Ligand binder design. Structure first.
Ligand SMILES: [Cl-]
Ligand SMILES: [Cl-]
Ligand SMILES: [Cl-]
Ligand SMILES: [Cl-]
Ligand SMILES: [Cl-]
Ligand SMILES: [Cl-]
Ligand SMILES: [Cl-]
Ligand SMILES: [Cl-]
Ligand SMILES: [Cl-]
Ligand SMILES: [Cl-]
Ligand SMILES: [Cl-]
Ligand SMILES: [Cl-]
Ligand SMILES: [Cl-]
Ligand SMILES: [Cl-]
Ligand SMILES: [Cl-]
Ligand SMILES: [Cl-]
Ligand SMILES: [Cl-]
Ligand SMILES: [Cl-]
Ligand SMILES: [Cl-]
Ligand SMILES: [Cl-]
Ligand SMILES: [Cl-]
Ligand SMILES: [Cl-]
Ligand SMILES: [Mg+2]
Ligand SMILES: [Mg+2]
Ligand SMILES: [Mg+2]
Ligand SMILES: [Mg+2]
Ligand SMILES: [Mg+2]
Ligand SMILES: [Mg+2]
Ligand SMILES: [Mg+2]
Ligand SMILES: [Mg+2]
Ligand SMILES: [Mg+2]
Ligand SMILES: [Mg+2]
Ligand SMILES: [Mg+2]
Ligand SMILES: [Mg+2]
Ligand SMILES: [Mg+2]
Ligand SMILES: [Mg+2]
Ligand SMILES: [Mg+2]
Ligand SMILES: [Mg+2]
Ligand SMILES: [Mg+2]
Ligand SMILES: [Mg+2]
Ligand SMILES: [Mg+2]
Ligand SMILES: [Mg+2]
Ligand SMILES: [Mg+2]
Ligand SMILES: [Mg+2]
Ligand SMILES: [Mg+2]
Ligand SMILES: [Mg+2]
Ligand SMILES: [Mg+2]
Ligand SMILES: [Mg+2]
Ligand SMILES: [Mg+2]
Ligand SMILES: [Mg+2]
Ligand SMILES: [Mg+2]
Ligand SMILES: [Mg+2]
Ligand SMILES: [Mg+2]
Lengths: 174, 174, 174, 174
């Protein structure tokens, strides 16, 4: 074992690798959403940029797991990054509903990791998750829910004008 | 009696305490409106912030009555702050209608205090009310009426797009 | 249930509402202390301002619970804010003793919430309490104890000069 | 009658002259207090300066009545300025007690003027009194009461150290 390794269970090391992969998968989904909203036949550029930003965020959170792994004396083991579940994302509402689900999936995986770290009496891992991931996740889930509520209010999916307006007012100008 | 007390009727002292309480009650109502518009299933953040600002305003106006009481040599006597009448506030129109009523209630209480101060020949109290409260109240009532007129124009309660637009254009960006 | 809700027990939601109320109650107590020290027959203005500051602090901490509730997909439910237990607060020593008790009461309620969150396996709630409340509480309790020790040293309640000096040196000039 | 005169009762004109005189009398009292605290055998220089400031304040308020008189088309009629009631003022407590009485005397005269202006249906005079005099008077009376309370707390008249400390901490350094 690594000369730095202390209080780091094999199960947690493996779960960190899995979480790394899931963050990369989430990044890739968001990248697909970006490309969809950039299409000439979709053309919601602020929406697209929102998803691009989130893709980069998730990639950063993957990298933070790699650094963590090494700091603890675990070993990074990479797996294929699965393509997103869809090739096209319907409209802003459908995309945001998918983003909500994705965020909740990532959140559940983080909560499960936290429970494993608790059961293996690893406070450093618990703190890392709490300090670097769990709050930012609650905030992302809240913001996407807020957005879904507004898209419904605006009459999505039918109300194109509502869709247009969301891109102008709800997401930052890009 | 207090060494500072001069020309300060017991009835006015008690009415000041009641007015203190009513301002605290109004503050609390507005806080409830803030929390409602912050809900993920409501999600009108500029509306929410409007109500938060008004809550803080009313709390400041309560504090000013406490300072006044003491300046005159009266004694602050606090009562429970009653919870708001509703737990949920429907939509922006219903909330603004409730705010209009609340403001008119506060205004009537201020006008009644003014009439008591007049009848007890207390010009200092009359000036305080005129200089610190009555105009700001007229302005708040006007602005909320203006808002109701615009919400109706926008098609509330049915027209969600209208609601969305009000939050973007009528209330300050928060 | 709310579309954002994940890993948020009904018991914790209700306990958050109760904690909201307790922070509002604590705010109101401190406001009463402010008004007492502002009286012409008390006239310890730096003491008064200390308590005013703490009132505003507690009101901010209530607001943070409202935001938290909504972020988790819980629902803010407000109750009456009970008036303080006393109308008058004796002197600086008695007031600080009451403040110590109040802070310890708030602290116990936060610790009980933390234990509930632990038992319901809610790390986000645990982190929120630890990061936003528990340390600031330890520091407030320490500072008030320090103050009690100094008030005793200064000869309170009998030694008026000691009281006068505490207001000049121990609390910030306001 | 003066070409500017409109809605200005002879009784109010005369009462303004009397009020002018009373402000000059109050100024002169405060000047006497200044000189007393400046004595080598009294030697409370911040106390002395407090009273000097108040003397100048009262002289300014006299001048404002002269300007008012002329603005309304009344005629300034001056009378002797009576010397203060005492030649020596005991100590800081006795002086502040005398100042409280003086301020309350001036306040009663202003309130009586206000009642005369009301009965003669002179809103301009009423506003002048409310806007320029009545609030500043409430504040002066409060501050002097606060001071008396602190002087008692400090053990006046017996406690010389208490007196010394009041001059250092309660009144501005001069
Ligand atoms: Cl290893
Ligand atoms: Cl290990
Ligand atoms: Cl292991
Ligand atoms: Cl597809
Ligand atoms: Cl975080
Ligand atoms: Cl009284
Ligand atoms: Cl009275
Ligand atoms: Cl009375
Ligand atoms: Cl309701
Ligand atoms: Cl006003
Ligand atoms: Cl829910
Ligand atoms: Cl849940
Ligand atoms: Cl539950
Ligand atoms: Cl009591
Ligand atoms: Cl903290
Ligand atoms: Cl000192
Ligand atoms: Cl000092
Ligand atoms: Cl004339
Ligand atoms: Cl005339
Ligand atoms: Cl006449
Ligand atoms: Cl004499
Ligand atoms: Cl004034
Ligand atoms: Mg080795
Ligand atoms: Mg292993
Ligand atoms: Mg495949
Ligand atoms: Mg954090
Ligand atoms: Mg984030
Ligand atoms: Mg996220
Ligand atoms: Mg995240
Ligand atoms: Mg007394
Ligand atoms: Mg009474
Ligand atoms: Mg009730
Ligand atoms: Mg005005
Ligand atoms: Mg206002
Ligand atoms: Mg108002
Ligand atoms: Mg108002
Ligand atoms: Mg729903
Ligand atoms: Mg429940
Ligand atoms: Mg009760
Ligand atoms: Mg634990
Ligand atoms: Mg932590
Ligand atoms: Mg901390
Ligand atoms: Mg604190
Ligand atoms: Mg505290
Ligand atoms: Mg605290
Ligand atoms: Mg002429
Ligand atoms: Mg005449
Ligand atoms: Mg004579
Ligand atoms: Mg008037
Ligand atoms: Mg004024
Ligand atoms: Mg003045
Ligand atoms: Mg004065
Ligand atoms: Mg004056």
């Amino acid at each position: 074992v690594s000369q730095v390794r202390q209080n780091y269970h094999s199960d947690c090391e493996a779960a960190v690798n899995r979480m790394l992969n899931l963050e990369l998968y989430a990044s890739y989904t968001y990248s697909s959403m970006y490309a969809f909203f950039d299409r000439d036949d979709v053309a919601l550029h602020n929406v697209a940029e929102f998803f691009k930003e989130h893709s980069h965020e998730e990639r950063e959170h993957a990298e933070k797991f790699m650094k963590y792994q090494n700091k603890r004396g675990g070993r990074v083991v990479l797996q294929d990054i699965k393509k997103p579940e869809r090739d096209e994302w319907g409209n802003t509402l459908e995309a945001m509903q998918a983003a909500l689900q994705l965020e909740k999936t990532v959140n559940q995986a983080l909560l499960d990791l936290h429970k494993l770290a608790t059961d293996k009496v690893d406070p450093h891992l618990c703190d890392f998750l709490e300090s670097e991931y769990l709050e930012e996740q609650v905030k992302d889930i809240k913001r996407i829910g807020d957005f879904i509520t507004n898209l419904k209010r605006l009459g999505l999916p039918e109300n194109g004008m509502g869709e247009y307006l969301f891109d102008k007012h709800s997401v930052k100008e890009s």
